[PDB]
């Protein structure tokens, strides 16, 4: 609830809309497994939909680690300093893509 959760006001980092819309996303760090069903979707993404994504947004600089990971994660690092870290665990490719887009 609102009383429990810490609150906030609406703002935009460094006035994005005024001058130029700046991509706030710096880095996506993809922890993937070579073997393991945990990261099948992730693997698929890496194979096909990651390169395209990268091409689409060159301000982002993607890393892909392939680090015998039992649960795959995608670490999204932003321009302010905040780090949004989210799992890719047993997700379909499309879903993963959507998540990435959102990030």
Q: Which is nearer to RNA, 1 or 17 (CB)?
A: 1
Kindly state the smallest distance separating residue 3's Cβ from RNA, in Å. Answer: 3
Q: Which is nearer to RNA, 4 or 19 (CB)?
A: 4
14: Cα separation from own chain's centroid: 21
Q: Would you say 22 and 16 are in contact if contact means Cβ atoms under 8 Å apart?
A: yes
Q: How far apart are CA 92 and CA 100, in angstroms?
A: 12
Count CA atoms closer than 13 A to 91's CA, side-chain side.
Answer: 19
- Partner whose binding site includes residue 7, from another protein, RNA, none (CB under 5 to 8 Å by kind): RNA
Instruction: Write out the residues near another protein by the rule CB under 8 A.
Output: 1-4, 13-15, 18-20, 22-23, 26-27, 29, 34, 46, 50-51, 54-55, 57-68, 79-81
């Amino acid at each position: 609830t609102a009383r429990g959760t810490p609150s906030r006001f609406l703002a935009s980092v460094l006035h994005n809309g005024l001058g130029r819309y700046v991509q706030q996303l710096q880095r996506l760090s993809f922890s993937v497994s070579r073997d393991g069903a945990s990261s099948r979707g992730a693997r698929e993404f890496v194979e096909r939909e990651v390169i395209d994504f990268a091409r689409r947004n060159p301000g982002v600089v993607i890393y892909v680690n392939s680090r015998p990971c039992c649960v795959p994660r995608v670490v999204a690092e932003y321009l302010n300093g905040a780090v949004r870290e989210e799992s890719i665990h047993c997700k379909s490719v499309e879903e993963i893509s959507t998540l990435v887009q959102k990030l």
